[PDB]
Structure 1
Amino acid sequence: ADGVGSSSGNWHCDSTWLGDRVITTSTRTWALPTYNNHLYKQISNGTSGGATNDNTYFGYSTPWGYFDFNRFHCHFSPRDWQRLINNNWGFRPKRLSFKLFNIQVKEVTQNEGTKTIANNLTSTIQVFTDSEYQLPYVLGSAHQGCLPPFPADVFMIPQYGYLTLNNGSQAVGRSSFYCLEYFPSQMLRTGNNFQFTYTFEDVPFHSSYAHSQSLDRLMNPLIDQYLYYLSRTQTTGGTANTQTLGFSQGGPNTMANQAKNWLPGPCYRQQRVSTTTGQNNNSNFAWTAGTKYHLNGRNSLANPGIAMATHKDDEERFFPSNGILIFGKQNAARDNADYSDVMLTSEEEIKTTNPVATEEYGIVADNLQQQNTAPQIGTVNSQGALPGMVWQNRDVYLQGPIWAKIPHTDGNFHPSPLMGGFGLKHPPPQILIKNTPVPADPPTTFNQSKLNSFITQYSTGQVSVEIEWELQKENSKRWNPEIQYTSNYYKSTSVDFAVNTEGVYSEPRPIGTRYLTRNL
């Protein structure tokens, strides 16, 4: 049975590689504190305080907390991530299991200056999953508070909150309030455990590979085309130079002129920034020159935006202003961190199919030329979908997110999340957890006011998550060797992806998925 003196689960951290499948399992130790002193609170921000209109909000913070494993380093060790990206053309999630076990509730009393902590054996926690998607879904915004990448670390559970419609700092009639105690929930004492299972819906494999061809090079280099293009509008001669028409076939020496079947993907142009700072304009342009969208009178940066190549050849010092993912190095500051404290990703691989984020999409015609008027052209800085476009998605990273919830709407176009990962109409459900309030002694004459005098408590336990992943094997006939992700050979003060002398785990660099190649 389950009692005070027996454990309700075991520690599972493992990975198993079987054929076309890999199964990861992770266990961590968590600590859960009481939030808001058991209260729900209205929160808002408005111009009155001095915020700009672009930052206003209205919402609620709750006493509850939630579990989040939406980063890949929750499930994969760095060596496992190497096995995946060097050997496979793609992967996708299939199913998951979740367990919550070995739960301990503790009470802390304050007397004079000294603080003491004891067990409370009869207290509970409450847990439920939102399986019908009835709550605002705050997973998928890339918040802090996921399970830690390193299995020995103990993490704090984050507080749940949400936003609803606002006008300035005020609410409107359509604004919704939610009470989370209004769902069914399971209550657990120190001997109880909790578990559920979930199945992923069909989703396309993430493409982990780069193309070894480019979209404008798909032709046979040895042969002419049978089609023709207009090669000459004027006679080339001694003196006159009158109007003429002349035509040529496309061939090996004019590839720019040949007829083609396909177009590069869409473009929304970003401003370019150099990591060599003396090359940048001297001014503070991050917001005023930023790439933005405009919704209901608010301006919001398109960050990272649609997938575009970070730079062209030999340009690596440049990046789009708001167009890339940027991670932190360990102990990086929250505000105004220096360039040496952060890690910049590069989407450079998709340069074959996708326009570079800092250039125009192309050129079109402005006017109607004639004998009287010379022709004029114009530059295309944003281009939506054209028939014949092909494109790649943004890459995924070991530090980065896995899935997002597709918003429930009448229409969408190519619902792949812009921060990267798998779009899901029915994502893995969110998991809510709370300490049950325990009153301090009531008065001995009746009073109708709600009791707000409590014994301070927190809880701890273990959590397990297990995901099964499907693999897509690499089939290539390429003769020469591939690029692989590898560790450095040379000696160093510390080992990458390990602890230091102080005990702190760190991740030296971001690692994407695209190493193997494939024909376009």
Structure 2
Amino acid sequence: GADGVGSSSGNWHCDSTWLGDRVITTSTRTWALPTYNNHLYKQISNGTSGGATNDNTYFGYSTPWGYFDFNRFHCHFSPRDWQRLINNNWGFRPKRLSFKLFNIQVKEVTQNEGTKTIANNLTSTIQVFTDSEYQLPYVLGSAHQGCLPPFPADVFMIPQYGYLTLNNGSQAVGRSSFYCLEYFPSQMLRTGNNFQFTYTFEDVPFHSSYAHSQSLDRLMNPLIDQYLYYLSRTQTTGGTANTQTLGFSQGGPNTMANQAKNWLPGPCYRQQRVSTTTGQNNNSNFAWTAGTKYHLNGRNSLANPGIAMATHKDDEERFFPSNGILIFGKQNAARDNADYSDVMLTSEEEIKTTNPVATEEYGIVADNLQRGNQQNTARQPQIGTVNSQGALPGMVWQNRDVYLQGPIWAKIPHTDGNFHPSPLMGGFGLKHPPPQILIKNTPVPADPPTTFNQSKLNSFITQYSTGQVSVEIEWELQKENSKRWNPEIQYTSNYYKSTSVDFAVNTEGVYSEPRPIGTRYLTRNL
């Protein structure tokens, strides 16, 4: 058509459409983009000279660009839409997305004395491009702030793009890369232009939006015996001097721990157990010294949250792995040293059926070769505790649950090999994820001098931009086909009276999410 100062370049479109095995969520927000870094790229680093430990060293670059992040589930689903999803579906996955950037408004700020004036700059541009070839460091999938807000009426600030590369302390090495984002083709938009692009998700397995109604060690028939035998006795009984013997029995309903089985629980990487009753915990600061870590290039990193393991066993909801769960913060919680009442701990107890408990061992194996007292001195069988266990043939396991406040996807690192590349924070591991959209205000110089100077211009017009952003994702559903007789467990609001509605604004206009909501409510058989 005809795009100009006086015409609108897009419409507000926030909705959700359920149709068959599909649900299409569309979302629109209003953003603001400042000028970052004074239009400069800056080398950033952190060494041990300052006072940091070797574990927190880095070397990277801070860019003047910003980026869009809709990598949380509440960016697309309302709390009621999340309820329709998790109460009626066994699984879901993303199919394709559309992204739009419209109604651009570039404004200039003047500051004579103590007066601040904001006026339109009708001829200024913003630059937008997507990293469709995955040529920049991918910083989505690290659970960073700056998402599209969950409440459609909130206006958000676009976060600043930065990246890291190889370091040796605060220094760089020969393989450290430097990226200029102006070295990419970018689209320039004045107040009358808009931007848009579409993306198609690759085939990714459905998320397991269910709990198991059987456990792995209870797949048997509780009425029939097994025809296989197991060693049930190595020493006679009854008499006064018991001797060695061999005795075998058939596993039945009363001895189900001895029965022969076909499968094994998933892998284990044991965590430390912490109680929410502080009086039960040890009186020391063991959050880091006793943490569950991995070692990479002489640098210790917390395995957080780590592989998917059950949070606790039966009747022990007060225990959690020290760094083995996702922890969200309540509305307006401190950044550092928030109290327990200010955060919301998740719980993966739904996978007790196949996954080992995060704070327990995997099992028991033998240590030595037992013998009698025939020739050499008698030796008693020794056993060892398996606290870490990699993949064994015949293992089955579930992934970590996704949450309304949690991440959606992550980029699978480009490596030679990987094992079960599902992100450890939960979500869909993608070889080619949604590309990151980079955005920036084109610099506008102030009046240059009237005599030539070779130096680069460092005096600019103060500016920022505003506009709307809409993202539409189509999800595929996996409906449940269950013959269970009794009613299921569902997610529900509390009927009782209260001061405020959950998932609503309070008297000051602050929207908040009172609890985290997983997706495992319906049940399945193993």
TM range (shorter): over 0.9
Kindly tell me: are residues 134 and 229 of structure 1, through their superposed partners in 2, closer, same or farther at Cα, counting changes over 3 Å?
A: same
CA distance in 1 between counterparts of 2:168 and 2:353 reads 44
Match of 1:488 among 494, 499, 511: 494
Q: Tell me by how many angstroms 1:185 deviates.
A: 0.5
| Counterpart residue number, 1:439 | 445
2:515 paired residue number:
509
Q: How far 1:238 moved relative to its partner?
A: 2.0
Q: How big is the shift at 1:373?
A: 5.7
Distance in structure 2 (CA, Å) of the matches to 1:267 and 1:388: 14
1:450-501 deviation digits (Å, cap 9, x = unpaired): 0110000000000000000000000000000000000001000000000000
Residue 204 to residue 294, structure 1, CA distance change in 2 (3 Å) = same
Aligned to 1:43: 44
Deviation digits for residues 405-452 of structure 1 (CA, Å, limit 9, x no counterpart): 000000000000000000000100000000000010010011100011
Q: Counterpart in 1 of 2:473? A: 467
Instruction: Give 3-state SS (helix, strand or coil) of 1:173's partner.
Output: coil
Q: Are the structure 2 counterparts of residues 494 and 373 from structure 1 closer, same or farther at C-alpha, using a change threshold of 3 Å?
A: farther
Alpha-carbon distance between aligned partners in 2 of 1:264 and 1:330, rounded to the nearest angstrom = 37
Per-residue deviation, 1:237? 2.0
The DSSP-based 3-state class of the residue aligned with 1:352 is coil
Residue-by-residue CA offset, 1:79-127 (whole Å, 9 max, x unaligned): 0000000000000100010000000000001111111110110000000
CA distance in 2, matches of 1:320, 1:307: 11
Structure 1: state its 5+ residue gaps: none
The worse-fitting range, judged by mean Cα deviation, of 88-97 and 230-239 is: 230-239
Provide the rounded CA distance (Å) in 2 between the counterparts of 1:461 and 1:443.
34
C-alpha distance in 1 between matches for 2:427 and 2:375: 54
Question: Which residue in the other structure is 1:62 paired with?
Answer: 63
- 366-375 vs 334-343, which deviates more? 366-375
User: CA-to-partner distance for each residue in 1:127-147, whole Å, 9 max, x for gaps?
Assistant: 000111100000000000000
CA deviation string 1:28-79 (max 9, x = no partner): 0000000000000000000010100110000000000000000000000000
Q: Secondary structure of 2:182's match?
A: helix
- 1:141-196 per-position Cα deviation (integer Å, ceiling 9, x unaligned): 00000000000000000000000000000000000000000000000000000001
**What CA distance in whole angstroms lies between the structure 1 residues aligned with 2:88 and 2:196?**
33
Task: Please give the alpha-carbon distance, in whole angstroms, between the structure 1 residues aligned to 2:376 and 2:419.
Answer: 44
| 1:215 equivalenced with 2:216 (yes/no) | yes
Q: 1:371 deviation in Å? A: 7.3
TM-score (norm 2): 0.98
Mean CA deviation greater in 229-238 or 339-348: 229-238
Q: CA deviation at 1:344?
A: 0.3
Matched-pair identity in %: 100
Question: Residue 240 of structure 1: CA displacement?
Answer: 1.8
Distance 1:10 1:515 in 2: 37
User: Higher mean Cα deviation, 368-377 or 158-167?
Assistant: 368-377
Please, what TM-score do these two structures have when normalized by structure 1? 0.99
Structure 1: distance between partners of 2:211 and 2:71: 25
Q: Provide the rounded CA distance (Å) in 2 between the counterparts of 1:4 and 1:118.
A: 14
Q: 1:2 to 1:267 in 2, by over 3 A?
A: same
Q: Distance in 1 between matches of 2:239 and 2:189?
A: 96
| Pair 1:164-2:168 in alignment | no
Runs of 4+ in 1 over 6 A off after TM superposition: none
- 1:372: Cα distance to partner? 5.2
Partner Cα distance (1:426, 1:283) in 2: 44
Worse-matched range after superposition: 264-273 or 362-371: 362-371
Give the Cα–Cα distance (whole angstroms) in 2 for the partners of residues 503 and 236 of structure 1.
75
Task: Report Cα offsets for 1:366-397 as digits up to 9, x if no partner.
Answer: 00118756611110000000000000000000
SS at structure 1 position matched to 2:481: coil
Q: Deviations over 1:199-246 (max 9, x none)?
A: 010010000000000000000000010000011101112212111111
The 2-side partners of 1:298 and 1:154 are apart by 39
Mapped partners of 1:24, 1:518: distance in 2: 27
> Matches of 1:242 and 1:19 in 2, distance apart?
69
Q: Distance in 2 between matches of 1:280 and 1:198?
A: 49
In structure 1, distance between residues paired with 2:330 and 2:119: 38
3-state SS in 1 of match to 2:83: helix
1:372 matched to which residue of 2?
376
Structure 2 unmatched runs, 5+: none
* 2:421 match: 415
Structure-2 separation of matches of 1:273 and 1:288: 14
Q: Please, which moves more after superposition, 33-42 or 238-247? A: 238-247
Partner residue in 2 for 1:388: 394
Distance in 1 (alpha carbons) for counterparts of 2:180 and 2:319: 48
| Aligned counterpart in structure 2 of residue 404 of structure 1, from 410, 414, 423 | 410
**How far 1:10 moved relative to its partner?**
0.3
Distance 1:416 1:65 in 2: 27
Displacement of 1:298 after TM fit? 0.3
Q: Distance in 2 between matches of 1:112 and 1:23?
A: 51
> After superposition, what is the alpha-carbon deviation per residue over 1:282-334, rounded to whole angstroms, capped at 9, x for unaligned?
01100000000000000000000000000000000000000000000001000
Distance in 2 separating the partners of 1:63 and 1:132: 21
C-alpha separation in 2, matches of 1:457 and 1:495: 40
CA distance in 1, matches of 2:375, 2:153: 78
**Secondary structure at the counterpart of residue 181 of structure 1:** helix
Secondary structure at the aligned position of 2:476 is classed as strand
- Alpha-carbon separation, structure 1, partners of 2:402 and 2:448: 54
Deviations 1:254-291 (A, max 9, x none): 00000000000000000000000011110110000000
Tell me, what secondary structure is at the counterpart of 2:95?
A: strand
Provide Cα deviations, 1:338-367, integer angstroms capped at 9, x if missing partner. 000000000000000010001110101100
Look up the SS of the partner of 1:49 in the other structure: coil
